[PDB]
Design a protein around this ligand. Sequence first.
Ligand SMILES: CC(=O)N[C@H]1[C@@H](O[C@H]2[C@@H](O)[C@@H](CO)O[C@@H](O[C@H]3[C@H](O[C@@H]4O[C@@H](C)[C@@H](O)[C@@H](O)[C@@H]4O)[C@@H](O)[C@@H](O)O[C@@H]3CO)[C@@H]2O[C@@H]2O[C@@H](C)[C@@H](O)[C@@H](O)[C@@H]2O)O[C@H](CO)[C@H](O)[C@@H]1O
Ligand SMILES: CC(=O)N[C@H]1[C@@H](O[C@H]2[C@@H](O)[C@@H](CO)O[C@@H](O[C@H]3[C@H](O[C@@H]4O[C@@H](C)[C@@H](O)[C@@H](O)[C@@H]4O)[C@@H](O)[C@@H](O)O[C@@H]3CO)[C@@H]2O[C@@H]2O[C@@H](C)[C@@H](O)[C@@H](O)[C@@H]2O)O[C@H](CO)[C@H](O)[C@@H]1O
Ligand SMILES: CC(=O)N[C@H]1[C@@H](O[C@H]2[C@@H](O)[C@@H](CO)O[C@@H](O[C@H]3[C@H](O[C@@H]4O[C@@H](C)[C@@H](O)[C@@H](O)[C@@H]4O)[C@@H](O)[C@H](O)O[C@@H]3CO)[C@@H]2O[C@@H]2O[C@@H](C)[C@@H](O)[C@@H](O)[C@@H]2O)O[C@H](CO)[C@H](O)[C@@H]1O
Ligand SMILES: C[C@@H]1O[C@@H](O)[C@@H](O)[C@H](O)[C@@H]1O
Ligand SMILES: [Ca+2]
Ligand SMILES: [Ca+2]
Ligand SMILES: [Ca+2]
Ligand SMILES: [Ca+2]
Ligand SMILES: [Ca+2]
Ligand SMILES: [Ca+2]
Ligand SMILES: [Ca+2]
Ligand SMILES: [Ca+2]
Ligand SMILES: [Ca+2]
Ligand SMILES: [Ca+2]
Lengths: 103, 103, 103, 103, 103
Amino acid sequence: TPQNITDLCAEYHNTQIYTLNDKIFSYTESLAGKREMAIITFKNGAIFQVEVPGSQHIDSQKKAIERMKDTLRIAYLTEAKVEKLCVWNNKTPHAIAAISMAN
Amino acid sequence: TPQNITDLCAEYHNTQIYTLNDKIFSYTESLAGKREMAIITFKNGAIFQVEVPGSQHIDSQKKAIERMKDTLRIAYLTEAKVEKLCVWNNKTPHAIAAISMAN
Amino acid sequence: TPQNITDLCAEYHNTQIYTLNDKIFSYTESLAGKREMAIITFKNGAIFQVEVPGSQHIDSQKKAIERMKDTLRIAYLTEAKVEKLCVWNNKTPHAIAAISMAN
Amino acid sequence: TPQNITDLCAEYHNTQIYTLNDKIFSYTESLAGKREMAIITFKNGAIFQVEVPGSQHIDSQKKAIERMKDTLRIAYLTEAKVEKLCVWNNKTPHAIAAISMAN
Amino acid sequence: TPQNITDLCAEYHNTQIYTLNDKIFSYTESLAGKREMAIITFKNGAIFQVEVPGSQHIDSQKKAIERMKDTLRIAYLTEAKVEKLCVWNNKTPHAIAAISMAN
Ligand SMILES: CC(=O)N[C@H]1[C@@H](O[C@H]2[C@@H](O)[C@@H](CO)O[C@@H](O[C@H]3[C@H](O[C@@H]4O[C@@H](C)[C@@H](O)[C@@H](O)[C@@H]4O)[C@@H](O)[C@@H](O)O[C@@H]3CO)[C@@H]2O[C@@H]2O[C@@H](C)[C@@H](O)[C@@H](O)[C@@H]2O)O[C@H](CO)[C@H](O)[C@@H]1O
Ligand SMILES: CC(=O)N[C@H]1[C@@H](O[C@H]2[C@@H](O)[C@@H](CO)O[C@@H](O[C@H]3[C@H](O[C@@H]4O[C@@H](C)[C@@H](O)[C@@H](O)[C@@H]4O)[C@@H](O)[C@@H](O)O[C@@H]3CO)[C@@H]2O[C@@H]2O[C@@H](C)[C@@H](O)[C@@H](O)[C@@H]2O)O[C@H](CO)[C@H](O)[C@@H]1O
Ligand SMILES: CC(=O)N[C@H]1[C@@H](O[C@H]2[C@@H](O)[C@@H](CO)O[C@@H](O[C@H]3[C@H](O[C@@H]4O[C@@H](C)[C@@H](O)[C@@H](O)[C@@H]4O)[C@@H](O)[C@H](O)O[C@@H]3CO)[C@@H]2O[C@@H]2O[C@@H](C)[C@@H](O)[C@@H](O)[C@@H]2O)O[C@H](CO)[C@H](O)[C@@H]1O
Ligand SMILES: C[C@@H]1O[C@@H](O)[C@@H](O)[C@H](O)[C@@H]1O
Ligand SMILES: [Ca+2]
Ligand SMILES: [Ca+2]
Ligand SMILES: [Ca+2]
Ligand SMILES: [Ca+2]
Ligand SMILES: [Ca+2]
Ligand SMILES: [Ca+2]
Ligand SMILES: [Ca+2]
Ligand SMILES: [Ca+2]
Ligand SMILES: [Ca+2]
Ligand SMILES: [Ca+2]
């Protein structure tokens, strides 16, 4: 089991770490059919999504996807500093696999 | 996959973007049978609903509807600025499909 | 579809409106068997319940009943001003059907 | 249907009301197998549990037990004054049936 | 039934109490397949996980595992003092069984 976000992300092909050290600049969420997703941006221009749940996901991931959207919303509203995001770079916008927060 | 609320909105027939750049003025919620819904308003007079779940909604939208009501409630209680809403303008009040929050 | 709490409330028999314009004074909840409910009070002495879920409630209402109790708890904790309640007056205490909040 | 915690409590055998009028001093929760429970303490040394779900609870209590643990966590974190707890006194620690908050 | 975290922890093999008396330094959450987990850190260098759910967990633990991740997130965002953690020390990072907060 990895002990940090960087090591976790390195377990996956098609992932990279973005180091933001910044609060989330905007938060977007959609309930439209086939676009049940969230999109966040940062002041530097980065745009990331939480993917629409789908065939690329195993059943163990469905609760986690819902948790990640909960996390991003509350981070946005508390202005919480996002340290790193582990993201899939084989999707546009890049898709969030993991997030770390620190003061 | 779209990169913002505007492009997302444009993927659907009968939707429109409203730009509010304002906090939610009022939040209303009902548990009454056949009226399990939320209604928000803005200072400018805009009134928007999250629809009662029914046959216009595919199963994947169900969770997303419940999430949208959570988001609108907490956005209200935190006085969070709403940037844009993507809505179905074929319903009265207009029905929320997506929301973006930013300053 | 109604556009406000008053018009919603009018769609049902045995309901009335209270206009509190005040924060919730007290919040109570219970997990005891057959009494899985919440009760709220206002400074003016009004007492209201979210009913125990039951045969009088259609399946679509079950999720809404849970949400209502979530809303009341967070409204209480943030000292959010309640504008109006729509309640059923054929129950004792009067039972909440819908709520509106505005600053 | 009762109108307050004291009357609700009096509808059950092996219950009593504690009147704390204080915030929760400590919050403990466990995910360990067979001890999926929460424990609260008050500064006066009183200790209470939310029981591990079990055959002593009817299905309708299952959601309400989960709500109670949510309520105690957020009360702890917001330093909300707990007015009274109704508890079953044939358990050790005494088991929470209901809570009121006021202040 | 135990009355505190130290006694609860002692009912299990391969556990120990860590006494932190400090807020969470970092919170990390992942939705990546087979790594649906959370990791927290403390200023002192301690790293702990909430395990990916697996065959080492019974059905009654599933909801509590989701609850714990909810608790850690909100503890982190509130800068809540964590008193103790009961952890499995035959996992790396050590795996959270129970948490107590007090300040
Ligand atoms: C920083 C890092 O870890 N790795 C690389 C990487 O980063 C760029 C790559 O993700 C491309 C993919 O198109 O997007 C660039 O950002 C765009 C923004 O694109 C949006 O945000 C990213 C993160 C993706 O989700 C993408 O799908 C989104 O559309 C766009 O919104 C606008 O801001 O323009 C920038 C490019 O200027 C990534 O660039 C990196 O992040 C941006 C925000 C900015 O900080 C750049 O300075 C930074 O490089 O690939 C690039 C390729 O040049 C480099 O190798 C990075 O080192
Ligand atoms: C009785 C008691 O509470 N602790 C013992 C115990 O503690 C050390 C032990 O848990 C080892 C792992 O076997 O880890 C040491 O911490 C590492 C950090 O490791 C991470 O956090 C711990 C808690 C585990 O989850 C581990 O899997 C994680 O990797 C590591 O991140 C880095 O910071 O280095 C430290 C020190 O090696 C535990 O050490 C204790 O806790 C740390 C935070 C610090 O306070 C240490 O000074 C302290 O000893 O075992 C040691 C003997 O190894 C002592 O008996 C403790 O009393
Ligand atoms: C973005 C866009 O295309 N806007 C055009 C649109 O806006 C009006 C329509 O959306 C109509 C359709 O009913 O409602 C108008 O607003 C009413 C308001 O309606 C409630 O809120 C709107 C957003 C809808 O969800 C309705 O279903 C709701 O009932 C009433 O509650 C209010 O009392 O009165 C206003 C009219 O003043 C929309 O008005 C626009 O948005 C409002 C909030 C104001 O900003 C107003 O100035 C705008 O015009 O249709 C108009 C036609 O005049 C324009 O073409 C807009 O571009
Ligand atoms: C109110 C009391 O508080 C503590 O002393 C517990 O050990 C008792 O069992 C009871 O819960
Ligand atoms: Ca700010
Ligand atoms: Ca702000
Ligand atoms: Ca901080
Ligand atoms: Ca204000
Ligand atoms: Ca006050
Ligand atoms: Ca306000
Ligand atoms: Ca204080
Ligand atoms: Ca207060
Ligand atoms: Ca601080
Ligand atoms: Ca405090």
